Amino acid sequence: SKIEKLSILGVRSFGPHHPETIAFNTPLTLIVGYNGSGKTTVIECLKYATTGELPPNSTRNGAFIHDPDLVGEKEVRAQVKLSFRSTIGESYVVTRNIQLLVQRNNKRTQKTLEGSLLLRNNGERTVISTRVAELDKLVSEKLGVPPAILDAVIFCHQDDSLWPMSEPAALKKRFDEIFEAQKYTKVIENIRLLKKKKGDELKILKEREVQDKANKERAELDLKDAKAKYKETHIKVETTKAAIEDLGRGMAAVDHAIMQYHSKMMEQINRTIAELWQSTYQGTDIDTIQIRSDVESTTSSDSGTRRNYNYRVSMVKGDTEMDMRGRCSAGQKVLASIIIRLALAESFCANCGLIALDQPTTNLDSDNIRSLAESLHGIIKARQAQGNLQLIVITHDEEFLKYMQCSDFCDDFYRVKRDEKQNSVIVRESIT
Amino acid sequence: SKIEKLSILGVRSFGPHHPETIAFNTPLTLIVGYNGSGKTTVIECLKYATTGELPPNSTRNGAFIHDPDLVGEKEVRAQVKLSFRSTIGESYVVTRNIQLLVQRNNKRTQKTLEGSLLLRNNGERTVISTRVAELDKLVSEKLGVPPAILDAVIFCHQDDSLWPMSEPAALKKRFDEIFEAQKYTKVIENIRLLKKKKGDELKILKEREVQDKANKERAEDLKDAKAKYKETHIKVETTKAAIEDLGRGMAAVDHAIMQYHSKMMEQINRTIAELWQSTYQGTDIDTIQIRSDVESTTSSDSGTRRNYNYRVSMVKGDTEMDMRGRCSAGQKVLASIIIRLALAESFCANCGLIALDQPTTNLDSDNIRSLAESLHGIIKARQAQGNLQLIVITHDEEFLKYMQCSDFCDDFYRVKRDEKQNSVIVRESITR
DNA sequence: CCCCCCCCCCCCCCC
DNA sequence: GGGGGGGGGGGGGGG
Numbered sequence: 001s002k003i004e005k006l007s008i009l010g011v012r013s014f015g016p017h018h019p020e021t022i023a024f025n026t027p028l029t030l031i032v033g034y035n036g037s038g039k040t041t042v043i044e045c046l047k048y049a050t051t052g053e054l055p056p057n058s059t060r061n062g063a064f065i066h067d068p069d070l071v072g073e074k075e076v077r078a079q080v081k082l083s084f085r086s087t088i089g090e091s092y093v094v095t096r097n098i099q100l101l102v103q104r105n106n107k108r109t110q111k112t113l114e115g116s117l118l119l120r121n122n123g124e125r126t127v128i129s130t131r132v133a134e135l136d137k138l139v140s141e142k143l144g145v146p147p148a149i150l151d152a153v154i155f156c157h158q159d160d161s162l163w164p165m166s167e168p169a170a171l172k173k174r175f176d177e178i179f180e181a182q183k184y185t186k187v188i189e190n191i192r193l194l195k196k197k198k199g200d201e202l203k204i205l206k207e208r209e210v211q212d213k214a215n216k217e218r219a220e221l222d223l224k225d226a227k228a229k230y231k232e233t234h235i236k237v238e239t240t241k242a243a244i245e246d247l248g249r250g251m252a253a254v255d256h257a258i259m260q261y262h263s264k265m266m267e268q269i270n271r272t273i274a275e276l277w278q279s280t281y282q283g284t285d286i287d288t289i290q291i292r293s294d295v296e297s298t299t300s301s302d303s304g305t306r307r308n309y310n311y312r313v314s315m316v317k318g319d320t321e322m323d324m325r326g327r328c329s330a331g332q333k334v335l336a337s338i339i340i341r342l343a344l345a346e347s348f349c350a351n352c353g354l355i356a357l358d359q360p361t362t363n364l365d366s367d368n369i370r371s372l373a374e375s376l377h378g379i380i381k382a383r384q385a386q387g388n389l390q391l392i393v394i395t396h397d398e399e400f401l402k403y404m405q406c407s408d409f410c411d412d413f414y415r416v417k418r419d420e421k422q423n424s425v426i427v428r429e430s431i432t
Numbered sequence: 433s434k435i436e437k438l439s440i441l442g443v444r445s446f447g448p449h450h451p452e453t454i455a456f457n458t459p460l461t462l463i464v465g466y467n468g469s470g471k472t473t474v475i476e477c478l479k480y481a482t483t484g485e486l487p488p489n490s491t492r493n494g495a496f497i498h499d500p501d502l503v504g505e506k507e508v509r510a511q512v513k514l515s516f517r518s519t520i521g522e523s524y525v526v527t528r529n530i531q532l533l534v535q536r537n538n539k540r541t542q543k544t545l546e547g548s549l550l551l552r553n554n555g556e557r558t559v560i561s562t563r564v565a566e567l568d569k570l571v572s573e574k575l576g577v578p579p580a581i582l583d584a585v586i587f588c589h590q591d592d593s594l595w596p597m598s599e600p601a602a603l604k605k606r607f608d609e610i611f612e613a614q615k616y617t618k619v620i621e622n623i624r625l626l627k628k629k630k631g632d633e634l635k636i637l638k639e640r641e642v643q644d645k646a647n648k649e650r651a652e653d654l655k656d657a658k659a660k661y662k663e664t665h666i667k668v669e670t671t672k673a674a675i676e677d678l679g680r681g682m683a684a685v686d687h688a689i690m691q692y693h694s695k696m697m698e699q700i701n702r703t704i705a706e707l708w709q710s711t712y713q714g715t716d717i718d719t720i721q722i723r724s725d726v727e728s729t730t731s732s733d734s735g736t737r738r739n740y741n742y743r744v745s746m747v748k749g750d751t752e753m754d755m756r757g758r759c760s761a762g763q764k765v766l767a768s769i770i771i772r773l774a775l776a777e778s779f780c781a782n783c784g785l786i787a788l789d790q791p792t793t794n795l796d797s798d799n800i801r802s803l804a805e806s807l808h809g810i811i812k813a814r815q816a817q818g819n820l821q822l823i824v825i826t827h828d829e830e831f832l833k834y835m836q837c838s839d840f841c842d843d844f845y846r847v848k849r850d851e852k853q854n855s856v857i858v859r860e861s862i863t864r
Numbered sequence: 865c866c867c868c869c870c871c872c873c874c875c876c877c878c879c
Numbered sequence: 880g881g882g883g884g885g886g887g888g889g890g891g892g893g894g
């Protein structure tokens with residue numbers, strides 16, 4: 001999977017007339033710029049292009065669309081275009097359009113216009129879909145990334161980048177999505193319903209079997225026919241019994257595979273998190289952090305067995321383990337959230353090396369700024385040859401840039417600036 | 433007027449055995465240290481000492497109290513001591529104590545022990561109060577600053593420092609708290625009750641007067657009749673006068689309140705406007721302002737209470753838009769600090785007390801430099817008046833350099849973790 | 865009449 | 880809005 005080029009028109013501080021573009025490097029796309037230049041907007045456009053999700057608190061009132069009053073028109077059309085290649089060689093472009101009207105009554109109304117996923121063959125166009133509902137499905141499907149991963153891990157909004165350190169209910173929600181826990185309980189539950197239904201049939205069938213057996217002893221129509229219906233019903237009974245077991249064994253197999261998958265996944269995730277923490281965190285006070293999962297089970301013959309995962313991020317010091325929630329510093333929260341997202345990206349999409357880190361050194365001190373950068377350099381070096389990585393870093397931290405030593409990977413970087421009209425523009429610069 | 437010495441024992445990463453102290457300088461207290469040193473804890477304990485409020489997300493599970501498991505004991509008692517001077521010369525110390533038990537049921541529970549406000553006559557201690565409910569009221573009076581200002585503005589938790597940029601209701605609640613509208617609106621309602629009651633008496637009185645007028649006219653004992661007519665008429669006029677006095681008093685009260693609200697918002701926006709133009713490096717935002725929208729019609733909760741809506745606007749050229757859902761991370765951080773500086777300056781203009789915890793979060797190099805230079809200008813201007821007590825926590829080295837603390841400081845404080853991973857506060861010297 | 869202590873209420877907080 | 884814990888308040892009792 002790979003993302004090639006992004007096009008932005010009329011989104012936030014990007015003007016409505018002339019599209020601005022950025023092309024993504026491998027293994028690293030570096031984006032710098034002043035406060036309010038428009039860097040975070042770039043990642044907003046990647047998330048919108050891939051999922052149709054708009055930034056939180058910007059979904060209505062057209063905060064996402066370049067404000068009509070600034071340009072002097074009563075209507076502004078926004079457009080985002082993303083070109084990418086699927087896991088197989090294939091080449092796609094997704095376009096999305098959104099409109100913002102200022103009516104004569106000053107009322108603003110936002111409307112989502114038609115978009116399109118189109119396939120390019122040898123450089124020539126074919127329409128795959130023009131329905132926004134399918135685009136979400138199709139793009140992630142082509143990219144090789146679940147939507148829950150695009151949303152929470154890869155294109156995580158800067159305002160939301162600390163979700164791993166949030167309250168338990170919220171944390172659970174995001175892991176439940178990432179693990180699709182609602183989907184598999186619905187699987188288990190449907191099988192259970194079917195099993196109960198086949199169970200009701202079996203009671204009726206055994207009755208009938210007892211009845212047809214007796215008619216055969218009395219006949220013993222006629223005894224030759226009397227044996228026929230007895231046999232027909234006997235087979236339905238035995239056949240139903242077998243069906244009941246198969247549904248039951250299958251139900252158990254599904255539950256077991258699901259429970260082991262979850263364990264394996266969590267074991268991998270905690271390993272990476274432990275490695276990332278021990279390498280990068282300079283403090284002595286926390287040796288490692290871990291995601292601990294507490295399963296709540298409720299078992300009844302009517303509701304069968306339903307598992308509920310509760311999740312916690314704990315920090316480990318010596319013998320002691322404590323829940324980090326409500327107990328970690330601003331800087332610790334920032335580092336833990338980045339590492340956990342890296343760990344999830346590595347476990348859940350082991351092969352698409354895609355993640356956006358928007359201003360990773362927030363609240364980090366000088367030592368941690370250095371080590372984080374060197375760890376990022378270390379991740380890149382290890383995976384550069386494999387061709388796996390498309391990593392996007394946004395920063396204006398000069399200390400961070402210096403220690404990353406990105407020139408080893410980059411021939412260029414992108415700078416987002418405001419022009420004289422105060423429009424966001426994206427200029428490509430030489431690594432020099 | 434001033435805060436002198438703080439003592440911390442068994443709170444978070446501070447060990448339960450030996451208390452750490454910090455002494456506050458004028459005009460500036462500088463506090464540095466690595467991620468997780470315990471710098472934010474210091475500000476929490478200041479809040480806790482003055483208002484009794486604990487850090488958000490820490491009122492349960494005793495997250496604020498140094499964890500019993502770390503020591504090898506099952507119970508920890510925390511203590512925080514703050515010595516300060518009232519608006520008058522008087523010298524006080526408030527002490528608060530907290531306990532966190534690992535119960536017979538295994539999970540932790542926290543309990544609030546005895547507290548004390550103690551007055552110092554040099555060489556003699558006197559308990560002014562040992563009422564944990566009363567400490568809040570007494571302390572805030574002595575400091576000369578309202579409880580909601582200590583909470584939102586002076587000692588605002590780092591996790592909460594962006595509240596000005598929060599959702600409308602959340603912003604409104606805090607401005608509401610800051611604007612104590614309940615006490616006086618209830619005064620108005622009680623006057624209104626009386627005014628209405630005199631109104632009914634007036635209706636009955638006017639009737640009786642018409643009756644007495646006719647009897648006087650019939651007599652034209654005539655002297656008796658004129659007496660009764662006058663008597664009744666003077667009662668009518670007297671009641672009218674009483675109605676007018678109550679009515680005018682009601683209006684004077686209500687008017688005084690609207691004037692106060694207007695006056696403050698005006699000063700607040702003046703200060704915010706100067707700071708923005710003075711501090712913000714960037715062409716895209718000329719100024720920011722706080723707009724107050726009154727709900728056309730006051731809702732009735734045991735009185736008629738006006739409902740204000742508040743919004744933070746950014747101004748560029750002719751155009752104005754709401755910052756909510758539209759500003760960058762750095763812009764949120766800068767706007768929130770400036771709004772707090774302005775809130776301190778207008779609402780407790782007399783005592784220059786504020787804590788800035790990691791003020792350069794997500795700020796670019798230029799905005800880091802200019803913010804530092806603006807603080808320098810604020811300090812230089814008011815140093816002579818002796819009012820100012822500014823507390824800055826930072827590990828931003830470029831920021832420290834532009835701050836030029838040597839002009840104002842003879843020493844600064846460093847927070848460290850000792851070999852046992854306990855937070856320690858070390859005092860260090862500066863050249864000038 | 866002051867207050868002190870306990871248990872319980874209710875209140876703020878967090879969900 | 881509700882639920883739970885804990886602080887505080889409330890009421891009864893004693894100093």
Ligand SMILES: Nc1ncnc2c1ncn2[C@@H]1O[C@H](COP(=O)(O)OP(=O)(O)OP(O)(O)=S)[C@@H](O)[C@H]1O
Pocket residue numbers: 011012013014033034035036037038039040041042062063064065066067070359396716757758759760761762763794
């Ligand atoms: N609807 C809108 N119309 C016009 N301008 C907008 C709109 N919404 C947001 N903006 C502005 O566009 C900019 C968006 O920039 P961001 O991508 O958040 O900046 P940034 O580069 O991430 O800066 P940071 O986060 O401080 S490092 C902000 O400066 C907003 O003030």
Ligand SMILES: Nc1ncnc2c1ncn2[C@@H]1O[C@H](COP(=O)(O)OP(=O)(O)OP(O)(O)=S)[C@@H](O)[C@H]1O
Pocket residue numbers: 285326327328329330331332363443444445465466467468469470471472473474494495496497498499502790827847
């Ligand atoms: N109940 C607790 N028991 C023991 N340690 C705790 C407890 N609560 C918090 N801590 C630790 O104490 C530290 C809190 O110190 P802070 O003041 O938040 O850090 P800081 O100096 O502000 O660092 P920043 O915000 O990253 S610059 C963290 O490292 C926590 O791991």
Ligand SMILES: NCCc1ccc(S(=O)(=O)F)cc1
Pocket residue numbers: 272275276342343345346353354355378379382
């Ligand atoms: N997207 C990169 C995911 C990743 C890949 C590798 C590592 S490492 O711990 O083994 F160095 C960490 C994170």
Ligand SMILES: NCCc1ccc(S(=O)(=O)F)cc1
Pocket residue numbers: 703706707773774776777783784785786810813
């Ligand atoms: N606590 C007061 C903060 C403050 C805020 C603003 C100023 S001004 O001189 O630049 F208008 C001065 C002081």
Ligand SMILES: [Mg+2]
Pocket residue numbers: 039040158358760761762
């Ligand atoms: Mg940003």
Ligand SMILES: [Mg+2]
Pocket residue numbers: 329330331471472473590789
């Ligand atoms: Mg902190």
